[PDB]
Write a protein that binds this DNA or RNA. Structure first.
Lengths: 192, 192
DNA sequence: ACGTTAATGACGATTAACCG
DNA sequence: CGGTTAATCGTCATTAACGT
């Protein structure tokens, strides 16, 4: 199915730009070629597109984070790897980031709990690394630091709608956001 | 007495929690203690509630930022004041932050341009202070740093839904997020 | 003013009725 | 299999039509 992939990619782009509710199934159909309710030959309803997109990305993030900590010999290398991983993600899959923290509530209850579980576990991987690096760090403080870092890195979605970010933009942004993130986590640590 | 204010405060809470489109006038009426499309005796349509909320907050933020830079003797004091101001906003008016960067697209075109103007000008205030502190800093890098800081500070809206909001939580979060922000901006600066 | 309860009218997700 | 186009059917914002 290259129509199945074409619909999901159209849905991803349109949900990011316009939001879930304001996107008309016919618009997704149209953008993929064929449309109105051709969609139902691939999917059983709107919601199922959103579910595939968000269950997919939330599972990928958790698996990728675990892979990073698995391969890392030491906790400093693990943190560096998690930053790199999430930075690649934030720069590369901005649309799925924007959908995940704008449209989570529009999931069927079952799917919503599955995505919240994968997200909670992704935060816990970061919290686990930060607390092992600083045994004096309270759970609550580690969580706050983690969310703050995701916010810092996910600030290209908020400064990038459909802009350049090919040449010096990609490499420059990566350098600056990594430096900001590394310094942020060091200062949090020396206050706490 | 304050029926207009009661509707806006209900609309602010519900738009933040459920998003603009999924909120029914009747839900806002209900919560304000005034069933139904009574709303039309105060406002000419849904959209006008969203417009008042977002034109209001975007104008406030710009005015507040200008006030901070006006009163500050030195650029270090100005940056500290802008951080404090935005931190107070992020901790205190989380609902309006969430609505502004989730539901901007659902404004009438005129209102959307007014809010984007006030947002652009608010970013420019931060950019002005950062470039005067570091004349070697390019415009593009200052903007990236500004957006990164807003992202970092607006990470309590994403970790806090009507939670606490208590003594130690407010003051603790403020301390930690300020330390992260100050360190982030110092490290960005010494890379650039 | 303000509010209440019935229309009205769109719009948009499913679904039915028909082809390869 | 996928697709099509013309019904349904619910759900709202918005208006009417009536009291305050």
């Amino acid at each position: 199915s290259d129509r199945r992939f074409q619909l999901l990619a159209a849905a991803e782009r349109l949900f990011a730009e316009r939001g879930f509710l304001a996107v008309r199934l016919e618009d997704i159909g149209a953008a993929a070629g064929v449309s109105g309710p051709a969609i139902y030959r691939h999917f059983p309803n709107k919601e199922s597109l959103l579910v595939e997109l968000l269950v997919g990305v939330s599972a990928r993030l958790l698996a990728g984070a675990r892979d990073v900590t698995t391969r890392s010999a030491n906790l400093a290398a693990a943190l560096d790897g998690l930053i790199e991983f999430h930075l690649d993600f934030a720069l590369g899959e901005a649309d799925l980031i924007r959908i995940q923290d704008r449209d989570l509530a529009h999931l069927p209850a079952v799917a919503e709990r599955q995505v919240r579980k994968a997200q909670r576990q992704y935060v816990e991987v970061w919290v686990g690394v930060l607390r092992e690096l600083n045994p004096g760090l309270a759970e609550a403080d580690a969580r706050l630091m983690a969310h703050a870092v995701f916010g810092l890195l996910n600030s290209t979605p908020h400064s990038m709608k459909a802009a350049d970010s090919k040449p010096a933009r990609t490499v420059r942004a990566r350098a600056v956001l990594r430096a900001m993130t590394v310094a942020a986590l060091s200062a949090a640590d020396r206050c706490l």
